[PDB]
């Protein structure tokens, strides 16, 4: 029941969800290859708990928006995001997803927070694979409830808990 209502139990389940981040592959653009390189045999996102990679949205919690989110893919991704279990986290990978990138035009959503609740933002073009590990570590200590912004605020464990989805 939501991972709450005991001081030890919420710490425990937050620990589990933090290190057991099961990525949901959503490769969009050239960010995708520097995403996969965070799993190659120089630098693997295969230690923290993300070795296995369930392409299914019904089985993976972290959605890595790796590339430009073109508008014709937005509504589809929409349902794909709703086709995730509720304990889900959404990372915005790359400049084109986090921001509009250099493609300031009619074609691209200029910030993916519009359609999906973003957990962590990561600048870069392409973000070095180790920066992707840094972003998942950021998300790690966020879902543990150990993350603070520049204004001093603690951030909720799971973004996408605060939106009247519909």
Asked whether residue 128 is marked as a ligand-binding residue, the answer is no
Write the binding mask 22 to 61 for another protein: x where contact by CB under 8 A, - elsewhere.
x--xxxxxx--xx-xx-xxxxxx-xxxx-xx--xx-xx-x
Least separation in angstroms between residue 44's CB and ligand HQK is 11
DSSP strand pairing (62-66 vs 43-44) = unpaired
Q: Which does 11 bind (CB under 5 to 8 A by kind): ligand SF4, ligand HQK, another protein, none?
A: none
36 is a contact residue toward ligand HQK (CB under 6 A): yes
Q: Is the alpha carbon torsion for 22, 27, 28, 31 positive or negative?
A: positive
Q: Nearer Cβ to ligand SF4, position 17 or 34?
A: 34
Residue 132 to residue 139: CA distance in whole angstroms: 10
The answer for residues whose C-beta is within 8 angstroms of residue 164's C-beta and 6 or more apart is: none
Q: Which one of residues 23, 57, 117, 126 is an interface residue with ligand SF4 (CB under 6 A)?
A: 126
Asked whether residue 96 is marked as a ligand-binding residue, the answer is yes
Q: Which stretch binds ligand HQK (CB under 6 A): 32-40, 97-105, 108-116, 140-148?
A: 32-40
Rounded to 10°, the helix 129-143/7-19 angle is 170
Q: How many residues touch ligand HQK (CB under 6 A)?
A: 6
Q: Nearer Cβ to ligand HQK, position 25 or 138?
A: 25
Can you tell me which residue has the tokens 């509720």? 86
Residue 164 to residue 118: CA distance in whole angstroms: 15
Write the binding mask 125 to 164 for another protein: x where contact by CB under 8 A, - elsewhere.
xxxx-xx-xxx-xx---x----xxxx----x-------xx
96 is a contact residue toward ligand SF4 (CB under 6 A): yes
Query: Quick check: 60 and 23 in contact, CB under 8 A?
Result: yes
Instruction: Check whether the bond before 126 is cis (ω within 30° of 0).
Output: yes
């Amino acid at each position: 029941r939501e991972g709450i209502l005991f001081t030890t139990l919420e710490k425990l389940v937050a620990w589990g969800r933090s290190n057991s981040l099961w990525p949901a592959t959503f490769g969009l653009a050239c960010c995708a290859i520097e995403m996969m390189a965070s799993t190659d045999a120089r630098n693997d996102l295969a230690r923290f708990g993300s070795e296995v990679f369930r392409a299914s949205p019904r089985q993976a919690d972290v959605m890595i928006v790796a590339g430009r989110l073109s508008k014709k893919m937005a509504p589809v991704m929409r349902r794909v995001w709703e086709q995730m279990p509720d304990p889900k986290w959404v990372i915005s990978m790359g400049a084109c997803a986090s921001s509009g990138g250099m493609f300031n035009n009619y074609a691209i959503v200029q910030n993916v927070d519009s359609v999906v609740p973003v957990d962590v933002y990561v600048p870069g073009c392409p973000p070095r694979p180790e920066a992707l590990i840094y972003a998942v570590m950021q998300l790690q200590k966020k879902v543990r409830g150990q993350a603070y912004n520049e204004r001093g605020e603690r951030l909720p464990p799971v973004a996408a808990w605060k939106r009247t989805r519909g």
